Amino acid sequence: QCFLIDKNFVNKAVESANLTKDDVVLEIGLGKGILTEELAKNAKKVYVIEIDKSLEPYANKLKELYNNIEIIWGDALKVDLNKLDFNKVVANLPYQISSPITFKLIKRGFDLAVLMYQYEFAKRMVAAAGTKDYGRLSVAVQSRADVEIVAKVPPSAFYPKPKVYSAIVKIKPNKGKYHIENENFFDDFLRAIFQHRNKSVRKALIDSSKELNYNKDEMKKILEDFLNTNSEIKNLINEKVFKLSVKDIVNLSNEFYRFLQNR
C-alpha cells in the first residue's frame, strides 16, 4: 500500500471537499490516519472503511483524541453503503478498486467526492470527446457527475514511492444534466459501442449486438429502421463512437431505447 505522507496534499483534498460541521464523511482506507485526523477536525463525523486489522493501533490512537470517528472493519466493495448516512467521500483510494468503487459510490449517491486515483485513470475520467483518453469510463462517469482534476500528485508525496503519478479528482453528481432513460439499457449500450470505439456507432452496435440481446442480422435490420425516424439520428449513428459527446451518446441511447420498447 502507498501511504500519503505529504500533508500539503492531505490539506488540498480536505480543502477541495469544502467541509462544514454539518457534513458526514465516508473515508475508504485508514492508512496512517493522516487524512482521517483532518476529516474528523472539519466534519461532523467520519466513517472509515478499513480491511486490514493490523492498522488498528492507529485507529485506537485516533479514537483516543477524537470521539467522531467510527471504523468499519471490512472490504469496501462488500459493505452495504445504503446502511450508512453520509453526504461526502474523501479518500486516498487503493488503486486496485478504483473502478468498481467509483460506480458503487456514484450509485449510492453523495453531495461531493474528493478521491485519489492513479493519474492515467483520472485522465480517462475527465477526458473530452474525440481524444485518445476518451472511452467508456469517461462517458460512464460524466453522464452522472461533473468531474475535474484538482491537482497532479508526484511519486514523492507517497511512501513507498510509486512508479507513476496520482491525481486528486473532484466528483459532483448531477443527475438532472443528462437524464438517462433506463440505466440498465444505457450501460449495455455503452459497453456495446466502446467495444469498437473507432468504428461508427452503427457498425459498433452490430459487431457487439450480443450486448443488447440481438444477433447481427436483427440489429442490422433494427438500425435501418431506426435510421428512418429522423436525420439527427442518421448523423449520429454514422459518426465514430469516440467522437460523440456525452450529451449525444445519452440522447442517442435514450431514443434507441424508446424505439426498441415501442417495438
Report the interface residues with ligand SAM, using CB under 6 A: 1-4, 29-32, 34-35, 49-52, 55, 75-77, 92, 94, 97
Supply the minimum distance, in Å, between the C-beta of residue 151 and ligand SAM.
15
Distance CA 35, CA 5 (A): 9
Looking at the DSSP assignment, which residues form a beta bridge with residue 97?
none
Query: Three-state DSSP class for 203?
Result: helix
Q: Is 107 within 8 Å of 42 (Cβ atoms)? A: no
**Contact between residue 194 and residue 246 where contact means Cβ atoms under 8 Å apart:** no
User: Is 224 assigned to a binding site?
Assistant: no
Contact 19, 44 (CB under 8 A): no
Q: How far is the CB of 1 from ligand SAM (least distance, A)?
A: 4
Closer to ligand SAM by CB, 52 or 70: give it. 52
23 is annotated as contributing to ligand binding? no
Q: Between 2 and 227, whose beta carbon lies closer to ligand SAM? A: 2
Residue whose CB is less far from ligand SAM, 78 or 132: 78
Cell of residue 59, nine digits: 485507529
For the chain, the farthest-separated pair of C-alpha atoms sits apart, in whole angstroms, at 68
Comparison of 52 and 183: residue with beta carbon closer to ligand SAM: 52
Cα dihedral 71/75/76/78 (nearest 10): -120
Q: Shortest distance, CB of residue 58 to ligand SAM, whole angstroms?
A: 9
CB of 93 to ligand SAM, least distance (A): 7
Is 120 labelled a binding residue? no
Question: Is 75 annotated as a binding-site member?
Answer: yes
Q: Is 4 assigned a ligand-binding role in the annotation?
A: yes
| Shortest spacing between CB 72 and ligand SAM, in angstroms | 9
Which residue has the CB atom at the shortest distance from ligand SAM?
31
**Pairing state between β 112-118 and 88-92:** parallel
Task: Count the neighbouring beta carbons within 10 Å of the beta carbon of residue 178.
Answer: 16
Given the complex with ligand SAM, which of 36 and 251 has the nearer CB atom? 36
